Write a protein that binds this ligand. Sequence first.
Ligand code: CLA
Ligand code: CLA
Ligand code: CLA
Ligand code: CLA
Ligand code: CLA
Ligand code: CLA
Ligand SMILES: CC1=C(/C=C/C(C)=C/C=C/C(C)=C/C=C/C=C(C)/C=C/C=C(C)/C=C/C2=C(C)CCCC2(C)C)C(C)(C)CCC1
Ligand code: SF4
Lengths: 165, 61, 80, 37, 144, 39, 732, 107
Amino acid sequence: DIAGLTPCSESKAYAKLEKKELKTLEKRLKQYEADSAPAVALKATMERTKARFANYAKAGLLCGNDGLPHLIADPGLALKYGHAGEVFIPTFGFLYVAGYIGYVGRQYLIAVKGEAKPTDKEIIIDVPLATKLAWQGAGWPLAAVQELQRGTLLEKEENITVSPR
Amino acid sequence: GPKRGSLVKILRPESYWFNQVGKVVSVDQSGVRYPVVVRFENQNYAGVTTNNYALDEVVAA
Amino acid sequence: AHIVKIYDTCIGCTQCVRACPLDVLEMVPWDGCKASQMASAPRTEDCVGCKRCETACPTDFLSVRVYLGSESTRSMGLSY
Amino acid sequence: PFVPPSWAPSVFVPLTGLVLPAIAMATLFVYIEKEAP
Amino acid sequence: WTVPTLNPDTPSPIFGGSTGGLLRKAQTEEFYVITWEAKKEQIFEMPTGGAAIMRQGPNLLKFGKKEQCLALTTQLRNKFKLTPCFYRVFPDGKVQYLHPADGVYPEKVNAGRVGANQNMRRIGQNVNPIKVKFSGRMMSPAEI
Amino acid sequence: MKDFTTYLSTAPVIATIWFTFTAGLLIEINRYFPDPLVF
Amino acid sequence: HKLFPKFSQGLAQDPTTRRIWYGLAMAHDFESHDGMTEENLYQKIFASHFGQLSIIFLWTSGNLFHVAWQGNFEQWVTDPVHIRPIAHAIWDPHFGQPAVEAFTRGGASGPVNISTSGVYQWWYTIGMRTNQDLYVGSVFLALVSAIFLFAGWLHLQPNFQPSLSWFKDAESRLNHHLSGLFGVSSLAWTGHLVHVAIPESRGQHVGWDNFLSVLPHPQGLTPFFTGNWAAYAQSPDTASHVFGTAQGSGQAILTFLGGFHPQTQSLWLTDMAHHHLAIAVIFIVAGHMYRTNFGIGHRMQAILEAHTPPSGSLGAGHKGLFDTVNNSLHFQLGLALASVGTITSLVAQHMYSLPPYAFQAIDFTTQAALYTHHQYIAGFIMCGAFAHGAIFFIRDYDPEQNKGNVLARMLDHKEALISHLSWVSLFLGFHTLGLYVHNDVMQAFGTPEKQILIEPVFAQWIQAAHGKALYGFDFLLSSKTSAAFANGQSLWLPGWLDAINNNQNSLFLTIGPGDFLVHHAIALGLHTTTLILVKGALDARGSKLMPDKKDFGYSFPCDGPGRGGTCDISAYDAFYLAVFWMLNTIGWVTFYWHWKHLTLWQGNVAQFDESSTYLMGWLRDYLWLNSSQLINGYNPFGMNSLSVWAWTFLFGHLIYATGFMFLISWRGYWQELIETLVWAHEKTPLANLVYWKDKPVALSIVQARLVGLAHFSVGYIFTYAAFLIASTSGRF
Amino acid sequence: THIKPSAQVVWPIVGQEILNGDVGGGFQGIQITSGFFQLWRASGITSELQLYTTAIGGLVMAAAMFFAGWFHYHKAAPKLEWFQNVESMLNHHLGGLLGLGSLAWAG
Ligand code: CLA
Ligand code: CLA
Ligand code: CLA
Ligand code: CLA
Ligand code: CLA
Ligand code: CLA
Ligand SMILES: CC1=C(/C=C/C(C)=C/C=C/C(C)=C/C=C/C=C(C)/C=C/C=C(C)/C=C/C2=C(C)CCCC2(C)C)C(C)(C)CCC1
Ligand code: SF4
């Protein structure tokens, strides 16, 4: 398919690796009882192994010569061959939660600078104000692009600068 | 220059609080070279929060 | 000898003088500050360059500056 | 007429290994420790 | 105030003898001699390590470097309220008084002192190092 | 009790509680959704 | 006082042992000597340059002489596949008879060293066949070295010292160095190739005896003056040509074929001839650009004053930069070091992948040694470029001459620069380390199918654009219906396609997720080293912690414990901290190079493709695995030829470790220890009759950093050199 | 002689379950090397119940130690001349601690 990679459900080293992990787990399994808790834990392990290999073969991942899933990081090639779930949807999910954390921290900083003890509200966290901003932070991309377009996202050149500049 | 308690802006370039805002304590009326006493709410690396400045190093902003 | 200089931002707080472990600095009459005092460095041949004076100076930036220069037996702090 | 003889390392390797370092370190030591007028 | 003279026949503090005393610098180059007058017999701390008893009256110690005499001066001045003065002695026998060189201690202003090494400008008003290239030596822009 | 809540509002205690919540949330998600690599 | 050093009486009046070290260290810093003017500066630099040239030609004549006398060159050229290249003979009276038998390898009388410098391949490709030829070359280059040393002595003499106007003439120096030093030298090397090096590969000896009576081509100069230049491309060397003989030869002297000679797996001599001829013409034409004493020509100050864009987006543009490049030697030195370092990286990257010399790339230890040698040279030269740029900012930069130009505007947005470099370094570090630690946890927990293996689709796209039909993109050189394919297909693409689709060479190696992760780690190292070096250059004038850093110079220890303490605040110390990141980054690129090539040379590239994606696979399958025959170089059962590399391996570990002592422990501890030593010597009877002339003191702070970095670096270099040479030579 | 001492087990999440190895005795865990098993066999402990009771006892003693800390700082805090009775402290620690300790242990 992409880059000479076969799909994992078509790959043979993928099936060999699945069979090898089952072989190691059953060689460890064959030295216990039946209803014993080590045997129960190893059968749960084998169930999770089979479920994991079936889910990775179901998700349409691409395997190499080693039988291991390879990820495709190109928006157009991923959206063309059905691989947006591995890099593209995770990167927009990450950027949503990372801007969430950063915007809630920025709103807490701006809220606590407007008092007579900003360092005291930085050492001892104002929990109601922090939870208020943490719930209100869900509209952070809209609020961020609005603060961008008003010219209030950015401080002017009243910043601290060195002698050189 | 500026009166007591008013906010100024520091333009001495090698100051720690250059391009930032402090508060005037007093202005000495002798022939002292740096009469404007400004306090800053943050400390420098020496842990000092107060410095003398000149009339053309402070701007009432 | 180390190059020690005094600048006109001095407020005559005498902190540098009482911080020097070598008696290099001293206070002289002056009119540039309210204290009517200025530091001076008449004995820089005995200066080792420890910079306790610079640590003790309150002004921002420093009004006393130590430029490490050519070494002698007194500036290296040798007892031998 | 280029090949140096078969005894040549037996002289040249201890020469620049011992004799010229001894002469060079003695000469540089006397040059370092020399007083100015 | 006049410049005092060194009395080499001054009794020394009671001290058993350290390994941290003088060396060949005292015989070849210089050593320094510290002198004070005590009010009572009292134990102090030697700057070279150890304890010593000062006598009641004139005392006399001799050290290698200058910071040892400053350390003992600071101890005797802040802990015992004494007024010592220490000199510089050469193997010729030349005796150089100092500290307090004016007679008044340098931590207070005295009329008659000439200000030395005073740049009459800020530190930010110094020139760039391009302006002091190719003099007779290495120079810093604060030297001019 | 007010001072005990101020102590619980101090920085290392809130870092401990919040990282315990975040780590437990990720642990719970990795238990009920075992081994996720995509989507 | 004392005489040494004569250039500084401030150091000559030092009563301590600091005088000797600081005389050794400030000897070649001519801008800070006593009584130094600007003409004297340029003249002593000119003499030192001649000294450097004489040392380089004496080095080359010595390599030639020791090969010609103690090697096996004439025996190597008969079968250069199975015979090892001898460097020089060993005379060590500390040896034993097992060591003499072990280093007596063959075919030699006594103990020898086996060379890994590529000089036999280079000399055999350029036409050397006998030892006498190497003797003549050694005598010639020793005479050239004597001439350059004499020319330095001569241009120091007062009837021959040039004036300041001769040194500050940039148009004449660029015209003569582009047209003559590049163009005519490349043209004369083309002449050497056509007249000597190609017929020596055809099996015909063209020496100085008969170079005027042997035709380079059967129709000499008649195509060249008729314009029928394609008559020199007719009948090239056949794909069954035995190199150095007449079987399968041709008549062409200037082809354009692409790819490699089939036997030697190396570039064609006719292609290299054409290549040096074309670049010779281009450099001679480019050497007529600037205005000397002939009316025509460009004026560089006029060009710089003209290239200022509208709207003020670069301010004053390049206004006033000619008087700051011309007057500063540190700007010119930083530019030269940046260019030469990037070109040394280019030399290494293009010589592993496109091997020029006959039976290079079958000598794997030579491949690894030359790559690693020019990569570490390139890293040191790049760090020196940024160091002398910081020295330019401290010493030579006049701000009023540069009020508004590009150099001042860089100092204006230095904080944005360092902030975005800090961001890219933190990003690459978090995610590269996180992916490696993630894959290590997956490999530890028995689940390799969960590990994050991002495919390098961008560089695979580029390899498909180059003509590699492995990844199936099939475009621009990989698709047969392309304009670039069809236009280059008649003349140079049929060799390039075969060489790039061969998977048995280093020409565009197959890449995977391990290659992804390592190129990301490489970008981390580059951005991070650039962060420290750019921060040291731009904070050299001063920072908010120290506004007057320009008043202390380039290399001062610190500014004391005040203001919270200021350790390693100087630009020299930023350089010092960045040498570690240089060594780290080149260690990464050469670990990667060496392990991917060892897995290519053994045959199992699957081993690299599987184990490269996790750092335990690195530590287990490269460092633990390839040092099995190294450390068995000597043992309680005997020794063999690898015992010198085992000893040098431990030697490098020891020097590294000794450097850590100067790196961690600092001065005042050692100063107190030395004072107790001074007491003990002056009180010990019958040894206090002996007294020092220089007072013993501990090493200074800056000297301590330099000595620790020196031991650290030498141990780093010797350890990896011993490991690389010993693993590659012991297993191949 | 053929069972490896193990007293730590990991939960089956994110694959870390593999750390529970075959230590023998029909058990899976991490082999411990503190030597508590040999200490417990030497002390004559035979059942898990006795170990459980020792655990409860040690927890009770920990609560007693933290109460003792709070008590001797906030409620009844010893004087300096109590702390300076070093002769008495040596007598009580050499007799009572080491002496009665090793006597009761020999018992
Ligand atoms: C980070 C840099 C980067 C790089 C090296 C690539 C590389 C690639 N892109 Mg991708 N792409 C990227 C980021 C990148 N992309 C981003 C950020 C977006 C969202 C804006 C896209 C959206 C995108 C689309 C919709 C497509 C690609 C495609 C490609 C492939 C061929 C195009 C090419 O060679 O242009 C070099 C790449 C750049 C100069 C970077 C800018 C990318 C621009 C914004 C889009 C280029 C699309 C191109 C015009 C389509 C060519 C069609 C092709 C059949 C010839 C190549 C592997 C094409 C493909 O699927 O090939 C099989 C394709 O259809 N890309
Ligand atoms: C400059 C590069 C160079 C290097 C690194 C070597 C290295 C070596 N030579 Mg070779 N040598 C060289 C050039 C070189 N040679 C040249 C060009 C000739 C022909 C004149 C020779 C003639 C020669 C002979 C006859 C022998 C060696 C031998 C050796 C080996 C032992 C060291 C020794 O005692 O040599 C002594 C060095 C010389 C005789 C030539 C040096 C003459 C130049 C002008 C001196 C340069 C000094 C340098 C610039 C600064 C060094 C001093 C400074 C650090 C204070 C060592 C491998 C010995 C050997 O083969 O052992 C197996 C041996 O017997 N060399
Ligand atoms: C700084 C340390 C350093 C060292 C020790 C080396 C060492 C080496 N280099 Mg490397 N190299 C370096 C830095 C270094 N290099 C840098 C900074 C660059 C980028 C400029 C290179 C670029 C480079 C290339 C491209 C090659 C090497 C090669 C080599 C190896 C062969 C020895 C040699 O160079 O012959 C000594 C060379 C000379 C004495 C000069 C050669 C002739 C010059 C170029 C032209 C002469 C013109 C002539 C005088 C004009 C006459 C005009 C006429 C009209 C009269 C040796 C391992 C070669 C190799 O790898 O072989 C296996 C090789 O091909 N180096
Ligand atoms: C084109 C080449 C070139 C030239 C002409 C110069 C010229 C200069 N450099 Mg620059 N520089 C260069 C390249 C160059 N450099 C490179 C490649 C680097 C990176 C290493 C630097 C990094 C650099 C720094 C950091 C500094 C200079 C300085 C200087 C100036 C004084 C040199 C001096 O006095 O030191 C004398 C030289 C020494 C004392 C060398 C000591 C030995 C070193 C540490 C290596 C030791 C390893 C040892 C040889 C290995 C032995 C192994 C054993 C087993 C045999 C002089 C202007 C200095 C300066 O300008 O001060 C303001 C300065 O501080 N350079
Ligand atoms: C393995 C050794 C090591 C590592 C990992 C680093 C990492 C770093 N160096 Mg350092 N450095 C090192 C050795 C190392 N260095 C050495 C030997 C020297 C010579 C003195 C230096 C000198 C040096 C300089 C001069 C600079 C750096 C900088 C950096 C940072 C560059 C940006 C980056 O990639 O950060 C990525 C972040 C990491 C690699 C850290 C990992 C983060 C961990 C995994 C998160 C926490 C994990 C876990 C929860 C911990 C729990 C433990 C608990 C007890 C709290 C990075 C943190 C640069 C910098 O600081 O820029 C901002 C910089 O300018 N280094
Ligand atoms: C001489 C002192 C001494 C020694 C050698 C022993 C030896 C032993 N004890 Mg016993 N024990 C002692 C006193 C000692 N006991 C005292 C005073 C107490 C009350 C606190 C105990 C309470 C105790 C318990 C509850 C247990 C043991 C156990 C053991 C055995 C386990 C290994 C061990 O403890 O390392 C050997 C210890 C040492 C080498 C250091 C002891 C030093 C003591 C504390 C100070 C003695 C100083 C002495 C005047 C000079 C000695 C100098 C130096 C050589 C030690 C071992 C036979 C275990 C057991 O019975 O297993 C079968 C066990 O469960 N001991
Ligand atoms: C600090 C300082 C300094 C230094 C600096 C440096 C050191 C720099 C470096 C730099 C560098 C080192 C840079 C680099 C660059 C590079 C580049 C810029 C490249 C480019 C390329 C290109 C453009 C290419 C393209 C292409 C391709 C890709 C493929 C195809 C072909 C072609 C050709 C098209 C100085 C002295 C100035 C002074 C001031 C200070
Ligand atoms: S450096 Fe040491 S000696 Fe020189 S002035 Fe400051 S304190 Fe006095």
